[PDB]
Enzyme design. Structure first.
Site, PDB file in Angstrom:
ATOM      1  N   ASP A   1       2.299   4.504   8.940  1.00  0.00           N
ATOM      2  CA  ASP A   1       1.022   4.812   9.148  1.00  0.00           C
ATOM      3  C   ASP A   1       0.847   4.167  10.340  1.00  0.00           C
ATOM      4  OD1 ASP A   1       1.192   1.986   7.269  1.00  0.00           O
ATOM      5  OD2 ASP A   1      -0.901   2.670   8.010  1.00  0.00           O
TER       6      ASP A   1
ATOM      7  N   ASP B   1       0.645  -1.021   0.317  1.00  0.00           N
ATOM      8  CA  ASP B   1       0.520  -0.421   0.051  1.00  0.00           C
ATOM      9  C   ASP B   1       1.222   0.986  -0.113  1.00  0.00           C
ATOM     10  OD1 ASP B   1      -2.119   1.783   0.086  1.00  0.00           O
ATOM     11  OD2 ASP B   1      -2.739   0.982   1.984  1.00  0.00           O
TER      12      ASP B   1
END
Length: 300
Positions: free
Chosen positions: A173, A155
């Site tokens: 993240d 991702d």
């Protein structure tokens, strides 16, 4: 063979929550002070993730996530500090990056920006070509390290990069991008969400993900950087975007993007995984471009 990487544990009492930064379906992220974390500072600012539920499936995953996060140490990978399992909820703690995710940061320095950027750390308004190339170079550096270790991100995107004091850019993240940036994923059957606009045709068609799929994604991250965080194929539906990728249609050069940078993107978007530029070569070309930023031609 043997248990494996050991996660630094943190006393609950050495963590003072201040306020939420973000919230999602299965998570919450807080700004916090952390007492007696590092020798030099009694207290310092951190980003603390709080898992919402403490089920045995979440507990197993969590420990696996933490082990993995503890293993990765690099100048362009978000610093992980440890966990706190001593009473609910389960917490993960990272360095705080004051400019937030690279997508939010780019949109705040766009031509279309709603307000002006607070701007004690960086000039408000559009960034210098040399700054854009510094962003792109630092993500490439974090990638070179991940590829080194045969780690596949799956991702990679500016939402999943963070920006710190002095426009330091790292990859990381808090697991909440599927909530906060839900339009960036395609809901495929049940509780599988795919970031199809950053995916290459071998990932969409064959469900294959490699270090070479990451390189394709990075090409789209470059496009994101040079459009000030615009969504790839923003006009197109998820289905339309899948047709383009699968039919060989390429994202157009951004107005802010020098052709030598566009050429790097096209090296990343070769249909054939083995024909794509290595992540080292891409990093070196960007470092070189960042040290001596091209005069970006005419907008005409």
């Amino acid at each position: 063979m043997g248990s494996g990487i050991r996660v630094h544990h943190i006393k609950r009492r050495d963590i003072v929550l201040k306020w939420e930064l973000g919230e999602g379906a299965f998570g919450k992220v807080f700004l916090a002070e952390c007492h007696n974390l590092l020798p030099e500072q009694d207290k310092m600012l951190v980003a603390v993730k709080a898992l919402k539920e403490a089920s045995e499936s979440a507990r197993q995953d969590f420990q696996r996530e933490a082990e993995l996060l503890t293993m990765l140490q690099h100048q362009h990978i978000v610093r992980f500090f440890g966990v706190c399992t001593e009473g609910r909820p389960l917490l993960m703690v990272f360095e705080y990056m004051r400019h937030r995710d690279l997508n939010r940061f780019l949109r705040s320095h766009g031509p279309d920006a709603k307000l002006l950027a607070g701007g004690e750390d960086v000039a408000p308004g559009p960034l210098g070509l040399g700054q854009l190339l510094a962003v792109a170079s630092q993500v490439a550096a974090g990638m070179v390290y991940l590829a080194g270790l045969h780690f596949v991100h799956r991702d990679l995107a500016t939402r999943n990069c963070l920006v710190g004091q002095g426009l330091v850019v790292k990859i990381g993240d808090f697991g909440m991008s599927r909530d906060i940036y839900s339009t960036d994923y395609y809901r495929v059957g049940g509780r599988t969400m795919l970031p199809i606009r950053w995916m290459p045709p071998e990932s969409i068609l064959y469900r294959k993900f490699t270090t070479e799929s990451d390189v394709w994604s990075f090409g789209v991250v470059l496009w994101e950087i040079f459009t000030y965080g615009k969504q790839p194929w923003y006009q197109l539906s998820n289905t339309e975007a899948i047709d383009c990728i699968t039919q060989g249609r390429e994202l157009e050069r951004p107005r802010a993007c020098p052709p030598e940078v566009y050429a790097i993107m096209r090296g990343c978007w070769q249909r054939e995984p083995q024909q794509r530029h290595s992540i080292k070569d891409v990093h070196a070309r960007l470092q070189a471009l960042a040290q001596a930023p091209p005069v970006y031609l005419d907008v005409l």
